Every structure is written in C-alpha cells, then in structure tokens.
Amino acid sequence: TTTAVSYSKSLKAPETDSLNLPIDADGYITIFDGKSLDGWRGYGKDKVPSRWIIEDGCLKFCGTGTGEGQTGEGGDLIFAHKFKNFELELEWKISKGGNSGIFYLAQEVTSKDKDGNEVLEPIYISAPEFQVLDNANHPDAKLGKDNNRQAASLYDMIPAVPQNAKPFGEWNKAKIMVYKGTVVHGQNDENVLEYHLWTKQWTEMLQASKFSEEKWPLAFELLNNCGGENHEGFIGVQDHGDDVWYRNIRVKVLD
Template identity: 50%
Template sequence: MNMNMRKSFWAFTAAALVAFACDSTKKESNENTEAVDSTAVSEVTEEESTAPNSLSAAEQEEGWKLLFDGTSTDGWRGYMSEEFPSDWKVEDGTLYMSASGRGEAGSENGGDILYDEKYGNFHLKVDWKISEGGNSGIFYLGQESDKYDYIWKTAPEMQVLDNEKHPDAMLGTDGNRKAGSLYDLYPAKPASAVNPVGEWNTAEVISYNGTVVHKLNGETVVEYHLWTPQWKEDVAKSKFPELNENWAEVAKEGYIGLQDHGDDVWFRNIKIKQL
C-alpha cells in the first residue's frame, strides 16, 4: 500500500469511528429519553388512578361506585333525618367532623350520617384519619328505627380509633375495641396493621351471604360469620343485648354509616362494589 493509500485508509477509518461513536451516543441519549418519558407516563398514570375520590378505569369496569366525590354531600343524610347535619363539613376533599368533646353524644348539630341506599353483599372501601385520642366508626348493614337513637344499636361497626391514647383500646376483651376490630366483638389482628394518628388508613369491609371480612391497609384483620350459633353466642357475651335484645339478628341488607363520636375525624375515597 503506497503512502497516499495508507493516508486515505486511516482517514476513512477515523471518520467511521467518529460516526459510530456519535451514532452510539445519540442512540443512548434517545434510549434514556424514552426511559424518562416512559417513567413519566407511568407516574402520571399511577397518579391519575389513585387520585382521591375518583375511580380508575379498572374500578369502573369492575362496577365500583363512588359514595363521596370530594366536593358535595350528595346521597348522605343524618340518621333518622332527611337533612345532612350542619356540623359535618366537606373540607379539602374529605368528609370531616370537628371535635365537640361530647363523646358518644356527638356534636350538637352533628350525629351519625349514612348513605341513603341499602347494601347487602358488597365490598366497601373507606380511607380514614383520626385525631389524637379520637374515636369514630364505620357502620354497615345498619337500620333506622324509632326505637333506637343511634345506628350502632342496629349495625356492626368497624372501629376507628387512636389505639395509643383513647381508653377504648384498653377496654373490651382481647383488644376488640381497637382500630379495625368489629367493635366489642372480634379484635383486629394484627393490631399493628393500623397507621399512626395523623396518617391515612384504608379500611375495607367485605360482606357476602353472612361472611364478613375486615381489612386494614391491605391486611385481613377480622373474619366472622353472621347468624351462626357461634355468632349468637359471641353477641350474647357483648354489651349489645343490653342495647337491643335482637342485635344478633343483623339485617341482610342495610345502610353504610359514619360515626360522630365527638372527635375530629376525616373520611375520603368512599367507594362500594355490589357482589
């Protein structure tokens, strides 16, 4: 190979290497950009699917229904009332009850509220947050009757509680008044499934032909069976027969309710699917 050919060969080789390097850098840059774009799309999709008080496309297809849209009290009213209690507020996308310090008596213009539609077989989801030392509850299969001044005299209750500060956590039997429990009957286990005061918790109640499951933050914490001999025996040992002698005969369908127990409590993402 003469000198001129050798110079041309090395010049061509150098140019090819530079072109290859540039192409590789460009390809790597494009791949990184695509990865970032993909991540961004994924994050947006995830954010949209978990936005408070909304249903994802999958939930809509599965038949979920929002019971609270974050802006209005449509569908909600007071227990034994046609009106929505004025002490309950829609605040920052939540159903909020402010503390009255009156305990079970609740607020003067508050009281327990319910969604004005009865459900039998269902899967309910509710996010809740309680104040320090606070107490509240989520009712299901509830009934209205002139004989009873509170919905909890007719309905099972999933307890909402500050387990660290409220005395109810130390009362009852085996922790059956702690957060997530079927109040005064079956304790939530593990009790550690609850998040600390000030943090949101996701409660779920699944009711199907008498089998009832409580879930708290994704963990199953209670399972029981309505109307069975064991159920009637357990109810007989609780405080409920003193309040309603027929309490064990829980209805096959009833109202979803939220409790005013005189403490600050917030609810959001209330949704239900009929089974």
C-alpha cells in the first residue's frame, strides 16, 4: 500500500512530479525509510547536498564543525512536498556536542540585492524550528531563556517541558503536529510544548525574538504569516555543521 506524493525538483519549482511512497493503516506516509533520498533536495538547490548521505538505513549529515557557517557541499535538506495540517514522527541521534534541528512550514525565500541579483534567504527566517541537541555538551543548552534552546524546544521561544532527551549517541523520538494552527512538539512519547500560530501571542513571541519587526522585517512578515498565504510549507533538517542521524521519517496528513 502506497500513495502519490507530489514533489518539486528545484528552487520554487511546481510539484509537477510524484512518488509512490509507503502509507501504513493509520495514514503515516514513509518519506524516508533508508532506501533512497527521492523527494529530498537541498533547500534552494536542485540536488541533495553531498554532505547529506544514506548511512546504514539512516539519513546522515557529515559536518565540518562550522556551526551556522554552512559549506558549499552542505546546507539544510528539505522533503520537497508542501504540508499544511500534518503529524510528523521520526528518530534522531546526535553526535557529542552536536546541534541540528527539524524545520516545518518552511518556504524557499529569495530577496533582491543592491545590483538586483536574486539572493537565497535562510530557511529559519520562514520556518519554526524543533531543536536537535546534545543538551549536556553543546553551549546553546545554557543560552537563551529557561532552557528554550535545548532539544525539542521551539528554538529560542518555548522550552521543552519536561526536558526528557536521551544523551548523545542514543536514539530520540521526535513529534511535530500542525493542526489548523495548533502546534504540539513531542519527545520520547511525551508532549513537551504547545502553541498557536497567527495569534496575538504568536506575534508578541516574535517581537521578543531575533526575528522581531525592528530587527528582521522580512523574517517578521514571513514568520508572522507562517506558511505564507496557504499556511503550508516544507519539513526540513538542519546543517548546523555537526554529525547527526535521522531515521523512520513518517508523516500523516491531517484532515
């Protein structure tokens, strides 16, 4: 049993092509089983970046330790199918002192520079992030406010309560549910936070972040109207310069 899943092949391209992916009895579509990277491509790219590989049934990023300073063969990886109301489930394993993340409702955003040239804007200026971290050894675990930069948090906004991440080198379960603006983060079979998009509280959360109206006007208008006019976007995984493994990536479309 499979379902036709549309996907785009390059920057802002339409979802002209389709894949027949496994769908279970409960409606969960396997978007990564460890057999291929079909449907996946680099954010703003027409190919899978070379540093993203299939290692022993796992999706692995081969980092160089440069953090946010992504290499030419790196960059964030998206599953090029736009989702709206969905429930994502996966397992992740982080390297010691490692950092990554799961992006959702992401848009491929470009902006015009001084000479009028098209510039690719980061995935994080449009996409909320589920933090992936070695809480014990990465310094980000001590930054922000009330541990809101630790594993499964809404990065720099809402902490995961309880903070039940397993240590580095152990498989952690992750859950992201988006249902008509209601967002729930799950970790190791527990709900760790909930929030609501396109509300007064969402706007005031953005005004107290790096993506405030005054600091980043483009990031503000994109995140304030998260998912664009259709409130939809891509699920992606982050290049934060560290080795990270993902497996059993499945998505249920919510009606």
